[PDB]
Structure formats: structure tokens, C-alpha cells
Amino acid sequence: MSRLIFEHQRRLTPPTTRKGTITIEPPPQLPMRTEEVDAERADYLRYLSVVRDNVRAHAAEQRAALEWSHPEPEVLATIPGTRRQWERDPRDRDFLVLRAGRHDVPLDAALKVKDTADEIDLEPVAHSALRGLLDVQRTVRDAPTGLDVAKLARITVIGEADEARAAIRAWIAQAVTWHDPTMLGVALAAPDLESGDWSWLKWLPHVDVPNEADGVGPARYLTTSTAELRERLAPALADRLKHLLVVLDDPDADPDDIARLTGVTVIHRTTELPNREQYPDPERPILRVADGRIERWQVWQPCVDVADAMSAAEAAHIARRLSRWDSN
Amino acid sequence: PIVRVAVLAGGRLTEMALPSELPLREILPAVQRIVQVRLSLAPIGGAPFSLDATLDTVGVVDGDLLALQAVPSGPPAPRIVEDIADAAVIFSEARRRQWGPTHIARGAALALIGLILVGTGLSVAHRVITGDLLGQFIVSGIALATVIAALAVRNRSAVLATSLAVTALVPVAAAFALGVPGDAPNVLLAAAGVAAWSLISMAGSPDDRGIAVFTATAVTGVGVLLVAGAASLWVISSDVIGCALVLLGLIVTVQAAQLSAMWARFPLPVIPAPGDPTPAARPLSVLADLPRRVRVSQAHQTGVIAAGVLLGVAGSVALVSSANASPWAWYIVVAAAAGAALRARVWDSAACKAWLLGHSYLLAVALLVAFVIGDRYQAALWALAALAVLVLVWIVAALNPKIASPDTYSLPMRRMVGFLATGLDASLIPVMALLVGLFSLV
Amino acid sequence: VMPIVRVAVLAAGDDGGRLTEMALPSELPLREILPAVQRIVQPVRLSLAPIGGAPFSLDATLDTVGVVDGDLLALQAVPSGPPAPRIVEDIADAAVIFSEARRRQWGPTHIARGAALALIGLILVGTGLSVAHRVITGDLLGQFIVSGIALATVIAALAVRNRSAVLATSLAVTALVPVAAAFALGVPGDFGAPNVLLAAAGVAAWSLISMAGSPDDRGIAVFTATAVTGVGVLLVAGAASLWVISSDVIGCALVLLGLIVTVQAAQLSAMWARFPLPSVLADLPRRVRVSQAHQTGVIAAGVLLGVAGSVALVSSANASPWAWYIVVAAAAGAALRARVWDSAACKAWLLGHSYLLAVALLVAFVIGDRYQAALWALAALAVLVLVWIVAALNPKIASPDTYSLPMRRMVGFLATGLDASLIPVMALLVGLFSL
Amino acid sequence: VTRHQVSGWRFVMRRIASGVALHDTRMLVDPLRTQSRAVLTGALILVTGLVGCFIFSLF
Amino acid sequence: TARIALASLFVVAAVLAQPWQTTTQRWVLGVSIAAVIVLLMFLTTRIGRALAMVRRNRDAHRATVVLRVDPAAPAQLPVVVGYLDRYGITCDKVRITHRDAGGTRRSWISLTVDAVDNLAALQARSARIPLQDTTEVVGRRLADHLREQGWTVTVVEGVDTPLPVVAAYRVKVDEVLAEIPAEETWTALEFTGSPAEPLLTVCAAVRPLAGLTPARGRPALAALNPLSTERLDGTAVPLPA
């Protein structure tokens, strides 16, 4: 009941994201002295190099935007104190977007060649260069990205304890560090919670129901019995707005134990892997948190090339340095 | 009325809630009775709280960290801070470490360098005065020792390795030069050995430290090899080997881009058929290594150019240094000089530009020393005056930063300069034919 | 109680800086105490780092990381991430892009260095050419050209004294080869002793007139070096030209004077501070450097004579073995006197005394038409580089800590006894005290 | 392989050379090709004068 | 070395007199003997010291800070010697001083700071050496550390003088320290060098008891001023436990 207050400040202006649609003039038609076609090759290759530099600029801008919106899961320690802590809003384009790791982004811009010189008999170089540009430059390199949790409704992870829980801690911290509790509320149900593990969650002002006491800490959504968890969660959900997260730590004991909603996106870890899981939905994915990557099940489609792991003590430091503030 | 803090006291910290509107007097005991002299709770790097106040009145927000420590017997130590201006200097202080053992490494390295050099020197002097078997024996011993030591620190230092490999090509050349009786075919063996060692060193090495020096020694070795070859099988005048050397230097300097390109194993183009191919996309692996291949290419290029100049002066000092060579030899010399000083407008890598521009000055020095060796002493003063003119135009270019900038000239002027640079090394070959006597075989 | 450590942190990132002491609880992850340090001394995270090192891991503690009470730690950034490696698929653009980080621009600033180097090479090779024109053949044209280029370069040095302050210093320090050449060719005869006298006089005069006239703190050290030896041999030169023939004693007096300048140096070193080298003590950083410079300069002279004299003792054959004792005595003396100077260049010159001695004996032998001992000089140089190597590998011999206090006392005592032990055998060899 | 293919090959090679030497790929003017072709026409003047003073020598 | 060198020169000019006869190898033998026996350096330098005293019958590079601790004790021995080198200031020497003007053992701590041994840190302050300022700051830091440690200390400005504007002494390796009979007995310890393993020295003064040493050839007593910027030239030696 005794902690500082906060004001729903106006989000800073992020670096711009020019979503233009740059086009490239098609290569020549390859009909005449060879010197002429050589000069034409030179002019076209110069134009292509210029447009390649412009595309590289576009890509660097997009990556700078994603960085400014998804810093590495160790810089966010300096976040909670500044005027940039709960800066995300339910209208922005990156809202409830948990950063999981770096891989190749599809380069939001267009890069559409105005293909009108049909009947492909093009100058071999002036066409090979264009094909190389269209196939290589169209993907930004390793850049922040992750899970648009607001449309997932279930995250099943797979792997050993101290790695699955590692990635879970990483992106749950990345979530609770850029949102007001009035928007999302984290929960948990674990048999061994008070163990230097998720006990750090104790501080997070995102884990308290409205109007409960429990003597010392208001609610402490954390518990062990999943049924008792839903009981403590009973009034919070009849909606099929405030988002939620409900994570689990017991491999067994029936995830999906709530529905099957409209903002309750449960997470759970298992050890059994699917056999021939039919049509991994756009939602409800399945993620093997491997040694150093996070592979999404798809019909093995890494889809995340370098994961993120936040140490237990680091999550505790985040929780502490965050528990000062609150807004009501 | 309660605040949840992390208190600290076995080598760890515990996390408990504590009342706020209360004196610490009745707080600390139970705190101990949870964690387990005048002890109290204090923030990190701060004076302990007044024993008779409340957590609320001191301003400890929920979630802070407090450690249980003793009460200092007296003042609070207000921890006066002093200001500083240029702390970046303090760093440069600690970076400039003392004598220690670090300087001992550079000392030992320079000592070994000097040892090998002076051994080679003493031994070649003994050989060129009166050479017993001991001379060649100790030369070969020193050379084998340094070449083994080069392959002994190959993966231990990667800095001493390349330096030892560089300095080792002097005793190797000395050894293989005087490994055969006589006086010449010796230089053939010498160039062969030095080129072999240069290649071996350049092959198994990281990106740089296989710097221009190595590929330059390699190329000049191949050139001197291909010249001593003709000097061995056939028998030819000084003019023939001079013209061959200057021509090799020119033909290497001119084709020093594609050669440096292929030396670094660039990802050769994949231009497809004209009918209906399927263009392949390059894999990210080699494309990631590319920015290393680029530097390797640059270094190889600078080395090829340096070796081209070393040839184009080694031959240039074979024609004029003789007693009295045809004025065509003088024209070939001046043409190669002006060519290697005008193609210095082409290249852009500053090292290549300097290596090219210097060609004339180095040629002046070489002509001077070859005249002094040949007891000329008369055209030597002329060479000194020519070098004085060279350094004079250098100076007038230095302290007048307009003559050394192409933008202050007219388009047709620089176009005519290009025409001249074309025509010079164009006519360089027919004059070589005239001088060598090729047009006297008909 | 609880183990705490009193440290002092330094953070200078925006304006000026802040250095202040504090008490931090040991056995805590730095990720826990960094916010307190920040709050006290005030998107990138910070961390403690020992000044002159790499930042600490955010998990380790001040105890295990190896911080003693009273250190000085800077507040740096969490080291880094990857540089986000660039990528280009065409090869020509790859070549043009990945080469920029060189300062490869030609510019009107490499031309200056090129012209200066060309001028220095011109001066050096012209002096060499003209000397080799005279010394071998012999005529007035050689010395004429040498003196002409020497006057030219000294006038050029005085002409650019305030033009660039570096071209001037370089031109001056290289101008003392043609000066010596010119002032070494008067009254030819057999080039005698007194030509060395005149050359040393000119060299010392130029070094003096340029040291105080120098525009800054620079390689002025070599100046004072070529100043001290400039006068040193000068004195001895006068003897061999004025008093008597003095056949062999030249090198004896030379090595004596070298040892004198070597040991009793700090006093004469600080003496130059009285001379005019050019806000209460704002010109302290200059002075000390200059001061240090003079030391690192003067000691160099203090060893040059040590060779330049010894080279005379064991030059020829059949020399008295007392010469082969005095040489090694001076060598060992200038070697063991490095333990006290504790500076970089001073220790370097004192150690390299024996190395330069080996090389000089070698070149004098090969000039002296001796080879059954030139190989011996090379072997001594080999033993020397071998002890250098074995010192570099295992820090045992040159580590002044892992020794015995009685052995340290005995080493200092032996050095103090042997460095001066040469003047008795000096008199016994020169016979000056056999009257 | 059509002549356009070999022409493109030579052009890519000369462009790579210009890149690694002149530090630009605009390829407006290519002094490298100029120098190379200059040495080549030197050799061609050589062989032309050769066949000239040869077929004259059989007057 | 110079004195042993000249003594070797003279014993060489003497040893060649194996026939101690002919008054040619005997009179010069005698002059060399009477020149060497007087030197074999405490008598020649005695003449030098007498000439200095008849010559002496008529800084901006070292700064000093002095504090008083009325409840003086050796318990604060470590916390002061630690200041030989810390916080990147490397105080050149520390000095404890005790006086007995009556029975009031007024004591003092004395820190010294050069400007060339730590020119870097000083230059980092203001680009024009705030030597006085930084010395005052390190004095304040030591004062606060001592005060919080359990004593009381006052940063003084201007202290009394152990020289009248009279007999100084020095001892080797505790009981003597309590023994140093007179009216005003000064006793000052000085630690120099490294904080881990320092070099200890001692100078005292009265107005020879068990192991003292007369101060023949007084400017040394002037240097013994706790405020003075000196090193009490007498000796230097490590210490046992």
C-alpha cells in the first residue's frame, strides 16, 4: 500500500519508420557494338548500387526502430526509473510484443520491381545483380523480434527446466517492463515457486488482484494449485480491456485448464513433444527452447536464431527496481 | 503501514516485509529473529538510519535494499566529492603500464631480430672476403633456426610469428644465394628460396600481418627467378636482363588489380546462360567472410605494386649503371619512371600512391649508389641533382596545397596528362625492342 | 558485523566528472550495488571497471573479482554487443565499401610527410655521396658540397622554427650528420685525431644551440644525448690532439668518462632544468617530461662512450687482458645499474649496453680483419639474446622480487665495488702511475 | 556461351578490378582498361613493325 | 663508489712499494697512506659538514596536510598507513608526531603529496595542478574516516614548531619510543613507499639514551616540522611484526 505513484505520460517519439514502397527500374533488354552494351551495363549497375544503398538505409532504419522498441534483456534494468518505463499503449503498433530474440525480419518495405520488360531475355549481368539484390537485401539481418502475445492465447514451450524457465523469465520481464498493470496482469501456478525462482515475481506490481489483502502483500497471484489459481482468477475473466498472462511451471497437470478467451494468453512448459501435430495454428504455437535457439513447430523452422536468457538474480533485480511505482 | 524490502546480512540476502510507522528500536530484534554491538538497517553506501525514527520518515520506498550493519561511533562521514575535468587522462595513465615483463617481450623480439641480421651480415662478409665452409654452414644454420622458430610460434603469438617470418627471408636469401660455388645462377636459387618462403608464410597466416611485404617479396622473387632463368640457360647482355626486368615490372604494375582480385579468391561471378537458366543466390557464409577478403585483396594489391616498383628499379639500375648504354636505355628508364609516377594518379590506396610516386626517388638513390660502386663519381653528382629536383617538386607540392589537387585544373589538361601516361608506357615496348636488338634479327 | 570495502568510483560521461569515495558491502552481485553508486555519483547499462582494464561481470562480487580496500574504479558501460555486421551481395560494392576504414585519403597531409622524408633522405644521401667522393678520392669539391648542404639545412631549420615545430625538429636532428661530416674534414693529412675534435665540437655546438632553441618537448633527449657525448669525446679528443700522442689511453679515458656520466647523472640531469627550455605551476607536465626526457637522453650518452671507449681497448689483438677486464667490468656495471632507474628508456639503454657492445665489437673486428674472434662476438651476442629470451619466457631472472635479501645486498655491494674497481686497473694499464 | 556472356564476364572482372583499385564502381571511365590496352597496343606496334621490317627484308 | 675508488687508487700507488725503501717508493707511499687512512666516508664528509655549517650559520612541488588527534593511540596505525597509496593519489609519506610540552601528548598526522609521482591524477582535476586542493581533500577524507572509526580529529592550519627560531636523534628497531629527561621531546615516525609493505623511519628531538644517534651536522630538525615538506633524511628500513 506504500509505494510511489506514476503518471500516464506521453510516449516519446520513436525513430521514424518510413514504410515507403521503393521501386527499381527493370534491367535492359539485351539486343550494336559491345562497347555500347558495356556502357549500359555500367550505368544500370551504378543505378542498382545506389538503390541498394537506399534499401540498406531503409533496413538500418527499421532495425533501429525495432531496437529502440525491444532493447536487449539486460538494458531494460535502467528502464523503470526513467520517464520511459511503461511507455507502451494499446494503440501503438508494437504493443504486447514480447522480445524473444534476434533473427531475420522480412524488411517491412516493399522493394517491388516494376516488371514490365516481360519475355525475359535480359542482359545476364544486369539481371543477375538484380536477382541477387532482390534475394539477399530483402531480409534485415539479426534484429529484435518476438511474440505478438495479444493474439496467441497459448504458448507451449518444450525443453529442460533451467532453459525453458530462462526464456520464460526473459520475455515475461520484457513484458512487465513496458506496460501499466492496469493493462496486463501476470499470474503463475508452480509447485516450487518460493525457491529463488519465480519468487522474484513477488515484487512485480503486475501480480496483484483488485482489492485483496493477504496481510503482507495485497494479492500475490502466485500459487501452486492451478485450480486455486483460477479461483483467485475467477472474477478477473468473463469476457469472451485488461490483458493477462498466466504461466505454468509443472510439465504435467493439464494446461488449457481455463477454456477450450479475449486477452488471457496462458503459457506452460512440457517435456513431451508432439508427434505429427496437425496444423500448428497461427495461435497456440509450440516452441522448443533449444540450446541457443527457440524453434517453432511447423509441420524444423528455427524462426528464432538467438534466444534470450535472464538470470534469476537479474529478474529479481528487475522486480525490485520496478516495485517502487504504481498507477491508479 | 508495511513495506517489503530486501535485507542483507552467510553471504546472501533475504526478502521480508517490515512495519513502517514504528521506531527501529523494536524492529531490529525481530529482524534478527528472522535473519538468524549496535546493529541497524542502512541503505547501500549511506549512513545508517537514526535508531529512533521510522522507515516512512526516512523515505525508504517499497522494494529498496537495506543491509544490517553496525552503528558507527560518531559522525556520518558526509562523503565529500571532488570534481574532475579530463578523467580520460587517468585511463591513459593506467594503460601506460610500467616496465614490468611486457617490455621484456619486445626487447627479446628485437634482440632476436638483431641477432639474425648481424649473423647474416658477418657471415656474408666473411664469405665475400674469403668464404670457408663455416660461412655457408652458419648461414644455413641461422636460416633454419629462424624458419623453424617462425613455425614454432605460428599459433602462439600471431604477431611475433609474422615478424620472424619477415626477417627470416633475409638469411634464407643469403644462404641460398651462396649455397653454390662460383660467383649468375646463384641469384636464381636465392630468388627461388625467397619466393618459396614468402609463399609458405603468406599461405598459413591470418588476414593481415601477411601484409604487402610478403606478397611483394613473393612477386619480386618470381620476377628475379624468371630473369635469372634466361640469364642461366641462354647467355645475354646486361641490357637484355634490364629490359626484361623493367618490362616485368611494368606488366605487373599495370595488371595489379585483377591479379590481386584472384589472389584473394573472390566469389567469382555466376553470369548465367542466355537461353533459360536459373540464377543461384550466394550463401550467407562466404558473404559474411567477404569483408576479410577485401582487406586481403587490398594488402595483396599494395604488395604487388611495391614489387612492381622494386622490379622496375632493379632493371632500371641494370641499364644506366653500366659504362655507356645507348640513349634508348635512358629513354626506357625515364619512361618507366614517369609511368610509375603518372599511374600514381590512378590508384587510391595511400600506400599504393606513395609506393608509386616514390619510384622515381628510389631510382635516383639506386642510380647514385650504383654509380658510386662503379667509380663513376661524375654522373653521380648528376643523380644527386636530379634527386634534388625531385625533392624540390615534392616540397613545392607540399607547402602549396593547390598544385596537388586535380580539381584546380582544366578538363583538357588532365585529359592530355592521361594521353601522355598512355603513350609513354605504350611506346615503352618498341623502344625495348630497339635496344635489345630484336629488330636486328631481320 | 559484515565485511565492507571502502572504494572510490569515477564517472565522467557528460560534463567534467565525479570522483568520490564510498563504502560498498562485499559479497554482493554488482548488479545490486550499481544503482546505489549511480544515485550517489549522479539506453545503456553501467558497471564498475578497474581503471586500465575491462568491466566486471554483472554477477560477480567485489570480493571474488579481486578488489582490495581503497581501489579506484571507473563507471563504464556494460562492455558491448556485436557491431551488427553489414552485408552486401555484389562484389564491387563490397570492395568499395569495406575499405573506407583506413584514413586512405591521400589529402594534403601525406604529401607533407612524404616531402619531409624525401628532404631528410636527400640530406643524408648527399652527405654520404660527397663524403665517399672525398674520403676515397680526395678533393675540395666533396667537403665543399657537404658544408654547403650543412649550412643549407641549419638555415632551413632556423627558418621553420615556428612554422611547424616538428618538421623543424626533425630537420635539425638530421642536420647533425652533415655538420659532423663537414667539421670532420679539416686539415686532411691522415684525418688524424683533431678532425674528430672539430666534428665533436660542431656536433655539441649544434645540439646545444638547438636544445634550448627547440620549439617543444620532443626527441630533445637525443639532442642532449648527442650533446653530452658531443662534449665528452670532445674533451678526450683534445688530449690526443694537444697533450701527447696518447696511443691507447684514449678509450680508457673515454670509458671512464662514460661511467662518470652514467652513475652521477641525476644531478647533472636536473641541472639542465635551470637552463631556459621554453598560472602558478601549469607548466608542470611539460617540465617533468622535459626533465624525464633529459634523463632518458643523458643516460644514453652515458652509455655511448661506454662503448665508444671500450671499442678502443679490445680493438686490436695482443692487447693487455686488463682491457678485456675493464670492458666487461663497465658492461656489467651499466647492466646492474638498471635496477635503480626504474624507467622505461633508462632501463632499456642500460640493459642494451651489452648488446650494443657486442655489435660494436663485432663490426670493429670485421673491420679489424679478425674472424677467429668475430665468431666469438657473435656467440656472446647469442648468449645475450638467449638470456633475454629466457627472461621473457619465465619472469625469474629480471624479476627483482623473487630473490634473497642477502643476495640483493650482495648484488648491490658487488656492483658498487666493481663499477669503481676499474680505476686501479686503469692506472695499472695506462702506466700513468708507474713513475 | 554467347558473346554477350563473355562480354559480361569481362565487364564484371574489370568492374571488380576498378572496385579494388580505384575504390569506386561507377565505371564511367576505366583507366585500368586504358593502361592494359596501352601496353597491349605497345606489343601490337612491336609485332607490326616486326612483320614490316620482315617482309621488307625480303625485297 | 667515488671514495672507494680513490682509496683503491691510493692503495695501488702504495702497493707497488714492495721494496719499501729508496725514499722514492716510500715518501709517496707515506703521502698516499696519510691520504687514504684519513678517508677509510665519515671524516672527509665531516669536513664537508663543518664547511656546510659555517656556510649555514646564516615549494610548489610537495604539499602537506596536518591533523590533530588528542586521543592518540596506535590503534589508528593501519588506517593511516593505508593512505600511502589509495584513491589514486599515492600520498608520498605519512608521519605520526608526538610532543610532550608538559604532559599533554599533543599528536599529529601528517600526509604528504608530491606533484610528479602522481602528476596524472592531479592533471586530471583541473589541467592546472590543484595540489593544495587535492591535499586538503585527502586530508578531509582521512579525517572523516578516523572520526567515524572512533576518535576525534580536527584539521589544523598552522602547527607549533619543533625548532627555535635542539638536539635531534634517530633510533633503529618500541621501548625507546616510550623513553624519548627534558622539557619538550618530539618523536615522529614516518612511513614511505608502498601501503602494503612500507618503509618505516623515526626521528626524535630533545631540548643518546639507549640506542640513539647524535645528529652531527639544525636543518634536519627544521625538516622535522610536521607541516614541513621533507622526508627526515636520516635513514630508511623495513619493520618486523
Side-chain angles (χ1 to χ4, degrees), chain B residues 3-268:
Chain B
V3 172
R4 300 154 293 174
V5 307
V7 290
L8 160 68
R12 44 87 177 167
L13 82 169
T14 195
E15 320 160 343
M16 195 50 195
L18 309 176
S20 54
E21 299 299 336
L22 216 66
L24 276 81
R25 306 260 292 174
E26 63 274 54
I27 289 282
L28 273 301
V31 174
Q32 302 167 346
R33 209 149 58 258
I34 292 175
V35 175
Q36 306 297 336
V37 295
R38 192 83 273 187
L39 300 188
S40 314
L41 295 198
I44 301 301
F49 293 149
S50 64
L51 200 52
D52 292 17
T54 66
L55 287 183
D56 197 328
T57 194
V58 76
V60 54
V61 286
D62 195 11
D64 293 324
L65 170 85
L66 309 179
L68 172 57
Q69 83 168 48
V71 166
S73 315
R79 68 163 83 266
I80 168 162
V81 53
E82 65 180 0
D83 207 319
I84 56 174
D86 269 311
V89 176
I90 295 188
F91 297 98
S92 158
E93 167 53 41
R95 301 299 168 173
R96 190 181 49 77
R97 70 277 192 192
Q98 267 295 340
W99 165 264
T102 313
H103 280 265
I104 305 278
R106 291 170 64 163
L110 295 201
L112 186 57
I113 299 279
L115 160 72
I116 298 166
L117 284 195
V118 64
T120 289
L122 159 66
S123 316
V124 62
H126 211 175
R127 171 60 193 76
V128 304
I129 296 316
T130 295
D132 65 350
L133 173 82
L134 186 63
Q136 308 93 19
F137 179 80
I138 67 173
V139 182
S140 44
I142 281 300
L144 194 149
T146 177
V147 75
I148 284 295
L151 310 185
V153 306
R154 172 59 66 81
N155 44 312
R156 300 175 83 253
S157 68
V159 167
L160 179 50
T162 179
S163 197
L164 271 180
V166 167
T167 180
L169 70 93
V170 158
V172 171
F176 283 10
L178 52 87
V180 163
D183 295 0
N186 315 296
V187 58
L188 190 150
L189 284 86
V194 73
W197 172 233
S198 180
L199 257 68
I200 291 178
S201 66
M202 199 213 79
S205 187
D207 55 328
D208 265 329
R209 292 165 169 74
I211 317 177
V213 58
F214 267 133
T215 175
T217 62
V219 160
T220 196
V222 163
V224 167
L225 192 144
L226 295 198
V227 168
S232 84
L233 316 181
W234 296 261
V235 304
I236 45 186
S237 67
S238 73
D239 294 27
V240 180
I241 73 170
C243 294
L245 270 176
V246 71
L247 175 70
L248 283 157
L250 173 72
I251 197 63
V252 169
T253 302
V254 60
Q255 207 167 333
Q258 309 84 320
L259 191 145
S260 186
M262 293 180 175
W263 262 77
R265 327 206 68 73
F266 277 164
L268 289 167

Side-chain angles (χ1 to χ4, degrees), chain C residues 209-228:
Chain C
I209 201 184
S210 162
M211 193 209 62
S214 54
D216 70 332
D217 62 299
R218 190 41 73 180
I220 188 167
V222 76
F223 278 163
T224 203
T226 197
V228 182

Side-chain angles (χ1 to χ4, degrees), chain D:
Chain D
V1 292
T2 189
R3 297 307 147 78
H4 312 294
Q5 181 148 342
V6 64
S7 68
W9 167 270
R10 280 183 195 278
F11 173 74
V12 173
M13 268 278 304
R14 282 190 294 103
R15 182 136 169 283
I16 291 311
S18 199
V20 306
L22 323 185
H23 290 247
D24 50 331
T25 185
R26 312 195 323 195
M27 266 303 302
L28 296 183
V29 62
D30 43 0
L32 278 187
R33 188 194 188 187
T34 298
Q35 307 284 352
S36 159
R37 205 164 69 192
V39 170
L40 202 64
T41 72
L44 287 191
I45 292 296
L46 161 67
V47 67
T48 286
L50 176 85
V51 310
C53 293
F54 175 87
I55 71 179
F56 175 76
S57 75
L58 307 181
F59 60 99

